[PDB]
mmCIF file with all atom_site columns, C-alpha atoms and ligand atoms in Angstrom:
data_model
loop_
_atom_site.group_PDB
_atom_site.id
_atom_site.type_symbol
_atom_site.label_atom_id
_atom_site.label_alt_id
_atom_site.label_comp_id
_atom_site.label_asym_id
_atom_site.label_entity_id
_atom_site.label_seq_id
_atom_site.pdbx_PDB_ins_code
_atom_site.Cartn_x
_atom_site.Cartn_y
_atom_site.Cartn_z
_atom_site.occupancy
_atom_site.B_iso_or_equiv
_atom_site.pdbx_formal_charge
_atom_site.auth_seq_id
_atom_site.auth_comp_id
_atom_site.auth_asym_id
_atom_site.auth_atom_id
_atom_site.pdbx_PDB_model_num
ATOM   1   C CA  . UNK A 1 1   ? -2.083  16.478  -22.707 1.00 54.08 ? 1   UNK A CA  1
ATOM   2   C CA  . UNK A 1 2   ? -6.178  17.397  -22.730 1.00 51.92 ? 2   UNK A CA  1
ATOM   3   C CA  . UNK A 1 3   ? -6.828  13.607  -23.418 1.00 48.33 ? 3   UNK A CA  1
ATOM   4   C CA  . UNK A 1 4   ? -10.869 13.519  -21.582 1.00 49.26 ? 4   UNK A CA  1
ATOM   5   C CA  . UNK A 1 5   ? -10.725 10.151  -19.512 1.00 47.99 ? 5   UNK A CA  1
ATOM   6   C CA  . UNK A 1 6   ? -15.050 11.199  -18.871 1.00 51.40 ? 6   UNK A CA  1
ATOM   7   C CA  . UNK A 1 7   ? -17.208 7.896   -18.807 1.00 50.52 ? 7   UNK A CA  1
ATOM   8   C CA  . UNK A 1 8   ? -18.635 4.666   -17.167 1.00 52.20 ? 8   UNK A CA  1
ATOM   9   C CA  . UNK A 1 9   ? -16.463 1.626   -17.434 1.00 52.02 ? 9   UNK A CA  1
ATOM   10  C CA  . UNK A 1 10  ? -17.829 -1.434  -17.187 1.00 49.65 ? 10  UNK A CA  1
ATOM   11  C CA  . UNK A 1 11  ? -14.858 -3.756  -16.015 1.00 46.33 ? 11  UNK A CA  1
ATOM   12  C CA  . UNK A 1 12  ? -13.601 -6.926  -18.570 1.00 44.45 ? 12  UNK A CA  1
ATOM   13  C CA  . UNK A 1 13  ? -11.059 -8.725  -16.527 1.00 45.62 ? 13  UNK A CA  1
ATOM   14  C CA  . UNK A 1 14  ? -8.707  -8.262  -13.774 1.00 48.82 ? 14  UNK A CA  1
ATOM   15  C CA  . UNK A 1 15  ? -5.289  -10.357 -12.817 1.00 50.87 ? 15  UNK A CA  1
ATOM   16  C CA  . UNK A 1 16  ? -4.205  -10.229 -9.369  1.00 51.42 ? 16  UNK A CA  1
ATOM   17  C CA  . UNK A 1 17  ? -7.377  -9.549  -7.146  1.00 53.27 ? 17  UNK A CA  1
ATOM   18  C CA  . UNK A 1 18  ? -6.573  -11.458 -4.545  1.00 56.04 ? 18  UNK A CA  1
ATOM   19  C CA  . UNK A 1 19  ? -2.628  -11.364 -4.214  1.00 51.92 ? 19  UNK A CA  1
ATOM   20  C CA  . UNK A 1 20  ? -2.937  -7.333  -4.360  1.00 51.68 ? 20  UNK A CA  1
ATOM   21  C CA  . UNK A 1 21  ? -5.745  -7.594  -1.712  1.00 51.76 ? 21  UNK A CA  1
ATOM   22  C CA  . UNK A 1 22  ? -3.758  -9.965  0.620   1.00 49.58 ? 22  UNK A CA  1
ATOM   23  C CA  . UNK A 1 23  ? -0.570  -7.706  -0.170  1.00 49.83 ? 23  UNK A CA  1
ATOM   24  C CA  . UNK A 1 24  ? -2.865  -4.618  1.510   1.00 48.83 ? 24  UNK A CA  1
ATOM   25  C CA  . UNK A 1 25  ? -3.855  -6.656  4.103   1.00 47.70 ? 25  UNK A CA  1
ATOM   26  C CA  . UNK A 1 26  ? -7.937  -6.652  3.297   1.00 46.86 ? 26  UNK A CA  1
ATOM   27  C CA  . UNK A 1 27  ? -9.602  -9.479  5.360   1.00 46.75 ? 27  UNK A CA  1
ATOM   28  C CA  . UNK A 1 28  ? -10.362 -12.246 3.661   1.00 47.35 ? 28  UNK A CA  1
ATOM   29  C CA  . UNK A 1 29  ? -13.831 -12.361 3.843   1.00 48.26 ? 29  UNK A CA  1
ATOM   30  C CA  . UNK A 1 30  ? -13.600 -8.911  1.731   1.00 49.58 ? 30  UNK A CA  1
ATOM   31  C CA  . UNK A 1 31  ? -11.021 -10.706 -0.706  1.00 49.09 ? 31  UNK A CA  1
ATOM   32  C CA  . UNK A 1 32  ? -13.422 -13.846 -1.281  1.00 48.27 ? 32  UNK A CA  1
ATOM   33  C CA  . UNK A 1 33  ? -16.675 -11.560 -1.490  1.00 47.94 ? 33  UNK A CA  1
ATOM   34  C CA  . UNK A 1 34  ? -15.403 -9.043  -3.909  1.00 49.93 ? 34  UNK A CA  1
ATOM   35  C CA  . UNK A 1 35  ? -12.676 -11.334 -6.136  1.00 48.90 ? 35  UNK A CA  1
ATOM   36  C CA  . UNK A 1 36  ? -16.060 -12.121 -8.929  1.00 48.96 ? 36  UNK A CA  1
ATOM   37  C CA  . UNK A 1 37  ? -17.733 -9.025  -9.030  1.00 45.47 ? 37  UNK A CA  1
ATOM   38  C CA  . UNK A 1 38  ? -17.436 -6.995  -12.439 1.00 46.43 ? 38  UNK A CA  1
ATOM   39  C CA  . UNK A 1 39  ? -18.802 -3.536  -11.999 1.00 45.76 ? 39  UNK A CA  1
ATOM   40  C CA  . UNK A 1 40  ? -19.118 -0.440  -13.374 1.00 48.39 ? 40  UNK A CA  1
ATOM   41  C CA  . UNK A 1 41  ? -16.432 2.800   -12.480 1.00 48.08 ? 41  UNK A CA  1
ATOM   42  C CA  . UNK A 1 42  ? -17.011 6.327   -13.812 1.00 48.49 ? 42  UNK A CA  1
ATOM   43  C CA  . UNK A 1 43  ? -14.920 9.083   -14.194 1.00 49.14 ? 43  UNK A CA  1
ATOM   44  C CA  . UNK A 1 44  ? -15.977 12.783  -14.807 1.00 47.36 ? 44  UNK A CA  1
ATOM   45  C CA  . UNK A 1 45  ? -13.379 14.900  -16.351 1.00 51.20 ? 45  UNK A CA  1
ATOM   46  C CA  . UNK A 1 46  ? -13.353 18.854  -16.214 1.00 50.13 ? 46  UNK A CA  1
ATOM   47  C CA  . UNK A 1 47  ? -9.907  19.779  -17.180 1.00 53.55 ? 47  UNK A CA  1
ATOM   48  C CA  . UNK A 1 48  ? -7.105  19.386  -14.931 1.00 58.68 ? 48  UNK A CA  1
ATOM   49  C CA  . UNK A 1 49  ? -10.560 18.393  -11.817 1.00 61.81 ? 49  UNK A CA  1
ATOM   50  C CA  . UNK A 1 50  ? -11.148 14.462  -11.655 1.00 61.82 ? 50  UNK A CA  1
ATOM   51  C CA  . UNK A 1 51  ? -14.001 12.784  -9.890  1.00 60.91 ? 51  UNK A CA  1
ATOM   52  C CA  . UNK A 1 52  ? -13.771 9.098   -9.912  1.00 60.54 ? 52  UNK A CA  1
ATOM   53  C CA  . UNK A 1 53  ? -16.653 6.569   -8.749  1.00 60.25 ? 53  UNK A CA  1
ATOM   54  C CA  . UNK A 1 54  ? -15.022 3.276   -8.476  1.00 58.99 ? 54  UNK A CA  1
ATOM   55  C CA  . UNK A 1 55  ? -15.995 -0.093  -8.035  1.00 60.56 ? 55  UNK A CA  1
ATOM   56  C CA  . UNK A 1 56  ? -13.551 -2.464  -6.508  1.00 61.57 ? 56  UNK A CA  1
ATOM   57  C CA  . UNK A 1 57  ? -14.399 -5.876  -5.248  1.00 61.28 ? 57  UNK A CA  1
ATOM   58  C CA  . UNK A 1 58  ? -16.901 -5.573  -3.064  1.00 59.08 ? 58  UNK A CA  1
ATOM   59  C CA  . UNK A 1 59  ? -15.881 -1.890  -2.132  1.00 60.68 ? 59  UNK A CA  1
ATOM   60  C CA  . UNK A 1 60  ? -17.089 1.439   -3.689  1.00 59.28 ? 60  UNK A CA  1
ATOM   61  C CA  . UNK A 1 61  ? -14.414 4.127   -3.404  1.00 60.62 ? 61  UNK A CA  1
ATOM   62  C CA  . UNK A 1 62  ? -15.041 8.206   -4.201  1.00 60.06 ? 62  UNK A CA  1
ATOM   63  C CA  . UNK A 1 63  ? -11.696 10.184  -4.993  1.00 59.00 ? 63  UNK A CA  1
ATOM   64  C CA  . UNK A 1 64  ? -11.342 14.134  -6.140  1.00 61.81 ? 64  UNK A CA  1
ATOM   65  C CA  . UNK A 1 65  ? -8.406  15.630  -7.140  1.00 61.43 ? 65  UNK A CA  1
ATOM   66  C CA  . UNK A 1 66  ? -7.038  17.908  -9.486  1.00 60.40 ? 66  UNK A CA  1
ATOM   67  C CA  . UNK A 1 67  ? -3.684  16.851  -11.520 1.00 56.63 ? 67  UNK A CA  1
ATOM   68  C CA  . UNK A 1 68  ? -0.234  18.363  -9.570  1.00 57.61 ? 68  UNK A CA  1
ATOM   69  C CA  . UNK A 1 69  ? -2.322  19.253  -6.165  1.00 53.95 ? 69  UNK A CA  1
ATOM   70  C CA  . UNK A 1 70  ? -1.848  17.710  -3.297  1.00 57.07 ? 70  UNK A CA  1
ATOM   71  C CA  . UNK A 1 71  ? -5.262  15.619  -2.304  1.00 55.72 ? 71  UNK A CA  1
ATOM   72  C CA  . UNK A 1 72  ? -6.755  13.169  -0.233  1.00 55.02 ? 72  UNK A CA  1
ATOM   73  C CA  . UNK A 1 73  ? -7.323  10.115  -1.227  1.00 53.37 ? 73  UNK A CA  1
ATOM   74  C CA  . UNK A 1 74  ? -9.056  6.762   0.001   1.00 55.90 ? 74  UNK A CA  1
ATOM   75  C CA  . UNK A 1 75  ? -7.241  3.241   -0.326  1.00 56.77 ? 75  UNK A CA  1
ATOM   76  C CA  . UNK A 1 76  ? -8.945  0.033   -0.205  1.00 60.85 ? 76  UNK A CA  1
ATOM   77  C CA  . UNK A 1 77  ? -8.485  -0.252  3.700   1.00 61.88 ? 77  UNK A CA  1
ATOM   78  C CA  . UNK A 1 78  ? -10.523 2.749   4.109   1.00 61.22 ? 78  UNK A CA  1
ATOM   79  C CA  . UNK A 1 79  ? -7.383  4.464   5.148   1.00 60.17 ? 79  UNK A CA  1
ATOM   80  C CA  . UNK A 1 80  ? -7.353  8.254   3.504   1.00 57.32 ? 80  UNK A CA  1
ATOM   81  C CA  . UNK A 1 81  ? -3.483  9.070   1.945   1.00 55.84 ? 81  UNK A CA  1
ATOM   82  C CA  . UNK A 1 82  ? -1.869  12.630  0.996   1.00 55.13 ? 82  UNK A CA  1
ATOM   83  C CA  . UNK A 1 83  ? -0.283  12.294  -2.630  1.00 54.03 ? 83  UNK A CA  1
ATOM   84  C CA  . UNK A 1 84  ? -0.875  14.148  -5.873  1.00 56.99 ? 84  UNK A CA  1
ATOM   85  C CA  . UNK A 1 85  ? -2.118  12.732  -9.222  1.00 56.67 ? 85  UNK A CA  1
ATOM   86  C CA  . UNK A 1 86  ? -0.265  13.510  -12.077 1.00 51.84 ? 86  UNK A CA  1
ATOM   87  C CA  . UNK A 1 87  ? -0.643  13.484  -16.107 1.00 52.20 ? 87  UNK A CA  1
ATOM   88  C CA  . UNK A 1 88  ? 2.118   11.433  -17.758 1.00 51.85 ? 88  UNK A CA  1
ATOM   89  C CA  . UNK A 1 89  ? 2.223   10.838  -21.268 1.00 52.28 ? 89  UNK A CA  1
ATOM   90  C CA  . UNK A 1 90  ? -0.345  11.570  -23.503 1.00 49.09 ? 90  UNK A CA  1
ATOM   91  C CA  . UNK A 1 91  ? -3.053  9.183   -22.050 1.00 46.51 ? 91  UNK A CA  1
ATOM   92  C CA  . UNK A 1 92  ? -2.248  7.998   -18.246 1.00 47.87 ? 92  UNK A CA  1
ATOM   93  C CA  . UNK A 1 93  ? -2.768  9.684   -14.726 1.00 47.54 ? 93  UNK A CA  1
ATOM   94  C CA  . UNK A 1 94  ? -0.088  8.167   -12.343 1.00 48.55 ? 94  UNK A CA  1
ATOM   95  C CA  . UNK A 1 95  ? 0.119   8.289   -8.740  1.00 49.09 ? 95  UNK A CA  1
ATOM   96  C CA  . UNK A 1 96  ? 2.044   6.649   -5.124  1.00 52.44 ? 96  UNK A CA  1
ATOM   97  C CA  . UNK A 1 97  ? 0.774   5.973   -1.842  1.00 51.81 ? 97  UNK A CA  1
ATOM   98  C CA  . UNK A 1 98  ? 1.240   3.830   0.670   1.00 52.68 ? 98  UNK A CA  1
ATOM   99  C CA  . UNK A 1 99  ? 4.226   2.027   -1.874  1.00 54.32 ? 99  UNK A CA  1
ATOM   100 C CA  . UNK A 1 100 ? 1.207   1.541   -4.498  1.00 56.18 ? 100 UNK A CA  1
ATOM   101 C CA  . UNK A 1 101 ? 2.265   2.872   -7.986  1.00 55.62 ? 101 UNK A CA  1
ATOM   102 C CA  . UNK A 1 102 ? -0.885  3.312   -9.485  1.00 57.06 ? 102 UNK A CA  1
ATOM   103 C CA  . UNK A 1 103 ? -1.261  4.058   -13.476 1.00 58.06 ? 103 UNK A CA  1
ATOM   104 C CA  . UNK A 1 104 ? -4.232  4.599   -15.085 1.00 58.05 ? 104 UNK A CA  1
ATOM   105 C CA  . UNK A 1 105 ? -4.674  4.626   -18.943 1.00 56.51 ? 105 UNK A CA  1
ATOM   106 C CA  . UNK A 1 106 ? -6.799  5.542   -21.737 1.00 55.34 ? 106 UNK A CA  1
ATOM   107 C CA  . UNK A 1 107 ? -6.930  3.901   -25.006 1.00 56.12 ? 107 UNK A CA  1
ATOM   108 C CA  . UNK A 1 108 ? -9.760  4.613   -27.220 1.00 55.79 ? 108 UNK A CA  1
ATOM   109 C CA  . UNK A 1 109 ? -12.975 2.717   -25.025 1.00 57.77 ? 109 UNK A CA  1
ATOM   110 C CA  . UNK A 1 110 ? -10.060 0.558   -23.166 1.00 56.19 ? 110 UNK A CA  1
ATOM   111 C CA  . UNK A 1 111 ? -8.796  2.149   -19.838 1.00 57.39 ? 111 UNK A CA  1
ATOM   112 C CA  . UNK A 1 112 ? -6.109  -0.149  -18.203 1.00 56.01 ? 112 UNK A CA  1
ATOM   113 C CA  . UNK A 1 113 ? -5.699  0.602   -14.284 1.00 53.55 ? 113 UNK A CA  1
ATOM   114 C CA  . UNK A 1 114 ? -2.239  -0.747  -12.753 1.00 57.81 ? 114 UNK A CA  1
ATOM   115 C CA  . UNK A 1 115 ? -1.428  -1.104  -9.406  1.00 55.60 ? 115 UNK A CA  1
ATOM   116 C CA  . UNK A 1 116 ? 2.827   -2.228  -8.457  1.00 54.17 ? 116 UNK A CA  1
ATOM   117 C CA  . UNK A 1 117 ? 2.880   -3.439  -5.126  1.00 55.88 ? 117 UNK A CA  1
ATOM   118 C CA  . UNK A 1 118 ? 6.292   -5.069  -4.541  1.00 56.30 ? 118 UNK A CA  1
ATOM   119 C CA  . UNK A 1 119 ? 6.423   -7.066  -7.712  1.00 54.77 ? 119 UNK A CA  1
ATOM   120 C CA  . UNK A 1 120 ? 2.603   -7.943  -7.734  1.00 55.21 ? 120 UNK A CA  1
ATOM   121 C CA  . UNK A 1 121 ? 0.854   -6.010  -10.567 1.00 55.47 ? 121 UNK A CA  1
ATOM   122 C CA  . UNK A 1 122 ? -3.157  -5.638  -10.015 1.00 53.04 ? 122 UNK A CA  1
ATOM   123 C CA  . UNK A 1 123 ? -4.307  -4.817  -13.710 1.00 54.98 ? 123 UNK A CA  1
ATOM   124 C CA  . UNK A 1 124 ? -7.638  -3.963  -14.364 1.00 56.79 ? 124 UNK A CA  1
ATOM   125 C CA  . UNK A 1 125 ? -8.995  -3.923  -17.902 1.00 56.25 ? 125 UNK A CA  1
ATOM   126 C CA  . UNK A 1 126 ? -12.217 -1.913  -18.719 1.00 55.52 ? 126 UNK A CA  1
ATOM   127 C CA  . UNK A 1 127 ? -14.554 -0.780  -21.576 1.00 54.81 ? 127 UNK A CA  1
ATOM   128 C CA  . UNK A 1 128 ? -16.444 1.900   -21.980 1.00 57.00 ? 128 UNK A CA  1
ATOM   129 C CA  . UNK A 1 129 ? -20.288 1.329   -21.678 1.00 49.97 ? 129 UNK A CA  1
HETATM 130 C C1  . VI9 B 2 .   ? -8.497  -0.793  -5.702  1.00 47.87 ? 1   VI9 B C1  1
HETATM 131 C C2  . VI9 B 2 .   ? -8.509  0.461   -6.599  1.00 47.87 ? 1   VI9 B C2  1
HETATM 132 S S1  . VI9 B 2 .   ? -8.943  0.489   -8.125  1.00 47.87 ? 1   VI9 B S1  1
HETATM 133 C C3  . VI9 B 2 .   ? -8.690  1.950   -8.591  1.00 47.87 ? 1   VI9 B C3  1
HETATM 134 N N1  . VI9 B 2 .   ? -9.006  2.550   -9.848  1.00 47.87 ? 1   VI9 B N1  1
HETATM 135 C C4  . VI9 B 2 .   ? -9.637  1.796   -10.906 1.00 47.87 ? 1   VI9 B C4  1
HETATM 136 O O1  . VI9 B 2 .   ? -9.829  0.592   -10.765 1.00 47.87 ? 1   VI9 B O1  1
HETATM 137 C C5  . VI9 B 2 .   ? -10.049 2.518   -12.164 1.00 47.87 ? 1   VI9 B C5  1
HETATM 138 C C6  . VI9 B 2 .   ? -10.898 1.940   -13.105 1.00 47.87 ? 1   VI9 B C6  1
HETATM 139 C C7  . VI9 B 2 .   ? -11.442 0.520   -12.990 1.00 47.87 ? 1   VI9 B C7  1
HETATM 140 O O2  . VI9 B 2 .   ? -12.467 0.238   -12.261 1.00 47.87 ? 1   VI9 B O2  1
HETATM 141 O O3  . VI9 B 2 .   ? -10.822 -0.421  -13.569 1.00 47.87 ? 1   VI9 B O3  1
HETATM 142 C C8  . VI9 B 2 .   ? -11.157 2.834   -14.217 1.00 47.87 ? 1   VI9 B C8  1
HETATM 143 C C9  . VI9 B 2 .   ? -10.481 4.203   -13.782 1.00 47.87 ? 1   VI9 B C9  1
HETATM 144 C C10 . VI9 B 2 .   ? -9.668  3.887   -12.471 1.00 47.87 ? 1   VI9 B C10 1
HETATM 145 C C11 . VI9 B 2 .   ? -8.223  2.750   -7.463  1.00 47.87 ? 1   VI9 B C11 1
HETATM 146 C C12 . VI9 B 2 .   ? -7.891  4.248   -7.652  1.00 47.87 ? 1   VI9 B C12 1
HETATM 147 N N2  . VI9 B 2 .   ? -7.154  4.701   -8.682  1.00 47.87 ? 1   VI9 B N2  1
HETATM 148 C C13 . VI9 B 2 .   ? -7.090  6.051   -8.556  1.00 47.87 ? 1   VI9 B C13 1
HETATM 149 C C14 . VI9 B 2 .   ? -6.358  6.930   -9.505  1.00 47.87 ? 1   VI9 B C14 1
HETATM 150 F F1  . VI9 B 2 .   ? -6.739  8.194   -9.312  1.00 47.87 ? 1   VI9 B F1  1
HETATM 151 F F2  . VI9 B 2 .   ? -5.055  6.812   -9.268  1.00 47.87 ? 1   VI9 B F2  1
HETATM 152 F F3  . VI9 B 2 .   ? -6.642  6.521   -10.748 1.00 47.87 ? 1   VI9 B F3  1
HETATM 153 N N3  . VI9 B 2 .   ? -7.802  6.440   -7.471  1.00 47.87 ? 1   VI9 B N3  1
HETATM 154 O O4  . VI9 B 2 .   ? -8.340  5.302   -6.926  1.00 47.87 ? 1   VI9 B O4  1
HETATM 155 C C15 . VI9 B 2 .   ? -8.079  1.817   -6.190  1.00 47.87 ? 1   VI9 B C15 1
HETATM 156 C C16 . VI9 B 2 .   ? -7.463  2.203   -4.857  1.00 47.87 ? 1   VI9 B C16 1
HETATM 157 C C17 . VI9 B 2 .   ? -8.359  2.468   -3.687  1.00 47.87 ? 1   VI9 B C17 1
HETATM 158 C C18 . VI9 B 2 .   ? -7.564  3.599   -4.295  1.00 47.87 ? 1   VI9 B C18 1
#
């Protein structure tokens, strides 16, 4: 799949905020800051090489990677995680760390981010701006 996930998301709605951010263990004052804020996340797409800018809570997280290489990335603790990225499907990037399985989808202007800790399911529904 060459399905370009490029653009600034501007985010709609979200379900789980603060059970997903208790489950990590963010402090509360974090959980209660962030829990109403609706920003924007970008990705920039150049083949297999993903940048993403994301907003989350009160947080603003930077990750690189390319799909099937091993990379670094940086959870919501601040805590920095070796895993790999990879393209399943025609439209989602799925990766696991730290028992997270995170999916990330593209439909149309709609990307849907997923994140399966345990059974609590952080969904994140955005449009492109
Ligand atoms: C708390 C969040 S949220 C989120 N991602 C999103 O929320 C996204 C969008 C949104 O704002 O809704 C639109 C595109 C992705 C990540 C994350 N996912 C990835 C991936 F590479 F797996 F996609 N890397 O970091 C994280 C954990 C700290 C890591």
């Amino acid at each position: 799949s060459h399905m370009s996930f490029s653009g600034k998301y501007q985010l709609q709605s979200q379900e789980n905020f603060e059970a997903f951010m208790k489950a990590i263990g963010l402090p509360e004052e974090l959980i209660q800051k962030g829990k109403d804020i609706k920003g924007v996340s970008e990705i920039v797409q150049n083949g297999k090489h993903f940048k993403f800018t994301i907003t989350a809570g009160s947080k603003v997280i930077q990750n690189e990677f390319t799909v099937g290489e091993e990379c670094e990335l940086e959870t919501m603790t601040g805590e920095k995680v070796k895993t790999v990225v990879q393209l399943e499907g025609d439209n989602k990037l799925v990766t696991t760390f730290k028992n997270i399985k995170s999916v990330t989808e593209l439909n149309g202007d709609i990307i849907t981010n997923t994140m399966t800790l345990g059974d609590i399911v952080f969904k994140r529904i955005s449009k492109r701006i």
